[PDB]
């Protein structure tokens, strides 16, 4: 029947009779042009932990709206348009985005800004317009903009105004959502540690309303991050994570993940079936050596 | 029958949705044939659209003006003059 058929349905039609005999599944094209879904993320607040100041702030800006929309409306506060995270590089800027997405149980959608840089008439323009349509179907979502961020957790990508032009479009679209629709279920995440990727629309109220600070790790914090990474794998059981942590100073969340992986090569050479505390001290010594560079 | 559809304007007094339902409704009337029905529709539309003006009703009536059915053109133009009343001229010019 015609209500099984729909626009953009993929169907099997007889080459014999030209009769649409069954329906498969619907197809799409931006979802395979470097945009992607990642359901139920594996990041937690304990992952890049020691985020306390941020935790309460981020919960109210993102999580409460999503969890309870009616409440925001009636209270007298419209939902925040964007959050920009600003603080030291290489922390867990990306990680945080995924963590929040998981918590509310919303779809994490990773957008490569530049990819959204086709050199044909409009094909790029097309994908940008479709990015919003898709996410409106897929609501709720965290739309995380990759390539505006310098992080050692993944990689520093982006150059030029080629992700500043894209960064602008995201902010217009939030106006547009409060605008004719009068909805908002879709929150857009900036992360940056860089001044040569900003906008003047970024600096403007009614266009982006929250600037939430990302702390530096500390000796207490490093222990929390380290603890998670060592208990996703096999380790000695008398361990003092606190001891290790005091030895790292200066060292971001991404470094706490590097310490474990460098410690592991030591374990692996000496043909152990677990890592030990020892490996971790030596690993902290290795990272400190790099920071001090001549 | 002519009077039944005329009656529906008066029944649709004080009823918010129903005024909206008219726009669905006159759609139904186009499907149904018969000279009695073709004659009645400019009048049905005219009465509703001077106790609740409808841009859709004006848009339809312009087309009825240039109709090859004689009785329909007749009723459309008198009707159209009914909608433009309340002013001299407007879009009516």
């Amino acid at each position: 029947n015609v209500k099984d058929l729909k626009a953009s349905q993929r169907v099997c039609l007889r080459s014999d009779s030209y009769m649409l005999h069954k329906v498969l599944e619907n197809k799409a094209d931006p979802l395979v042009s470097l945009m992607m879904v990642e359901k139920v993320p594996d990041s937690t607040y304990d992952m890049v932990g020691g985020l306390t100041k941020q935790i309460k702030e981020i919960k109210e800006v993102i999580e409460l709206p999503v969890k309870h929309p009616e409440l925001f409306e009636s209270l007298g506060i419209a939902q925040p348009k964007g959050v920009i995270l600003y603080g030291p590089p290489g922390t867990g800027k990306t990680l945080l985005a995924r963590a929040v997405a998981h918590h509310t149980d919303c779809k994490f959608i990773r957008v490569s800004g530049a990819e959204l840089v086709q050199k044909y008439i409009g094909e790029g323009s097309r994908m940008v317009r479709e990015l919003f349509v898709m996410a409106r179907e897929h609501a709720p979502s965290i739309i995380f903009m990759d390539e505006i961020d310098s992080i050692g957790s993944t990689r520093v990508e982006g150059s030029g105004g080629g992700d500043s032009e894209v960064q602008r479009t995201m902010l217009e679209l939030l106006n547009q959502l409060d605008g004719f629709e009068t909805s908002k279920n879709i929150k857009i995440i900036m992360a940056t540690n860089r001044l040569d990727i900003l906008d003047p629309a970024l600096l403007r109220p009614g266009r982006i309303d929250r600037k939430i600070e990302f702390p530096p790790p500390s000796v207490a914090a490093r222990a929390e991050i380290l603890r998670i990474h060592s208990r996703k794998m096999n380790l000695t059981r008398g361990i003092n994570l606190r001891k290790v942590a005091e030895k790292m100073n200066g060292c971001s969340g991404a470094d706490v993940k590097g310490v474990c992986t460098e410690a592991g090569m030591y374990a692996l050479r000496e043909r152990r079936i677990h890592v030990t505390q020892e490996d971790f001290e030596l690993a902290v010594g290795k990272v400190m050596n790099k920071n001090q560079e001549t | 029958l002519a009077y039944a559809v005329l009656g529906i304007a008066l029944i649709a007094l004080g009823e918010d949705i129903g005024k909206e339902m008219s726009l669905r409704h006159f759609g139904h009337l186009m499907h149904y044939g018969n000279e009695h029905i073709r004659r009645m529709v400019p009048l049905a539309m005219g009465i509703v659209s001077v106790s609740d003006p409808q841009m859709k009703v004006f848009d339809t009536l312009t087309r009825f003006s240039h109709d090859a059915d004689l009785e329909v053109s007749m009723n459309s133009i008198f009707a159209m003059g009914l909608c433009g009343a309340g002013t001299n001229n407007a879009r009516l010019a």
Binding site: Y18, K56, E60, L64, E73, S74, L75, G76, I77, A78, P80, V117, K119, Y120, I121, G122, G124, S125, R126, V128, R129, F132, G160, G161, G162, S164, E165, V166, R168, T169, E172, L173, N175, Q176, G179, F180, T182, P200, A201, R204, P205, G206, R207, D209 | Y32, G33, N34, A93
Partner: protein
Amino acid sequence: FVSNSEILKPFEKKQEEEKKQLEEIRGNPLSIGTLEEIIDDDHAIVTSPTMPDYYVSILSFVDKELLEPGCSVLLHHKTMSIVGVLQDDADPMVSVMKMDKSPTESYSDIGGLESQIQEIKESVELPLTHPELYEEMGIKPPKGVILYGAPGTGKTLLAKAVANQTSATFLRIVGSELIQKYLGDGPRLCRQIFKVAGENAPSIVFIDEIDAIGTKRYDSNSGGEREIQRTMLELLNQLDGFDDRGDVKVIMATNKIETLDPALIRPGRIDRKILFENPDLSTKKKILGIHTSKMNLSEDVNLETLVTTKDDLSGADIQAMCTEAGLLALRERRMQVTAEDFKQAKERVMKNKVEENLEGLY
């Protein structure tokens, strides 16, 4: 049933006869295609998407004076005869246009900016409302207008409000993103915009934050100067090329207008360059009044008191304040919003605007 059936059976009968006769000839699989051109030998050359192309006969479903090139038509198996005509598909306001159909806000909700509102009106709202002055006189209403102010503060508000009042599709273009940095992308993007707008008139081409093709150069060289200049020139030529009294209306937008050339504005089409003045005291009361409606608050709040100490502050400030005050209540685990909260939000925003020391505050 039976009452219906007596009118029904012949009314059914004339449509069915036409239909029958069509379907037999029209028998599937018939390829859909595009008319390339309609020829001097009364043929049409067609571009078939199956790769041949042909000189084709027409069966007058609707006539050739009612048919134009690039229209979609349905073509026979080999000779590609036009068996029936089709309606066009994939109109491209879903690819170069972000659409805001019947957008929100109005003139009453920011009122107190009333003198500027009449100005904007006179080019856009008013010709629709009263054609007659414009017609009789014989001079045209300005095609295009430029708004300068700031996003979420007054520029955007005026644009939502006016567009909705005229019931035209507000079609939002990102100026900077046109910005595509390779020789082929922009001038087409621009052409494709203007085309679709005029077709499906009256329509608003809203060009948001054009700052980057706001240069003019005396000489053009290379790709690095010429790209920019090609995009600028394309806007200028389309305006200069056609004239429209409101098949296409333009709102151009920029923060300040001192970054637009006066030879890109083009007097005599764009005659209005309309300013942004700050909300004054009456307006603040109003802007507030609208934003306090949506609220659940305490009765110790005095809308009046907070307006009076605010020194001539932007509509943005007023929005911001409400949004800020709700947060101070939400954190404290409550849904009531006391006066003290509004006041703290007011003190913070008022300081930042009024910071400009040793050259403003000498």
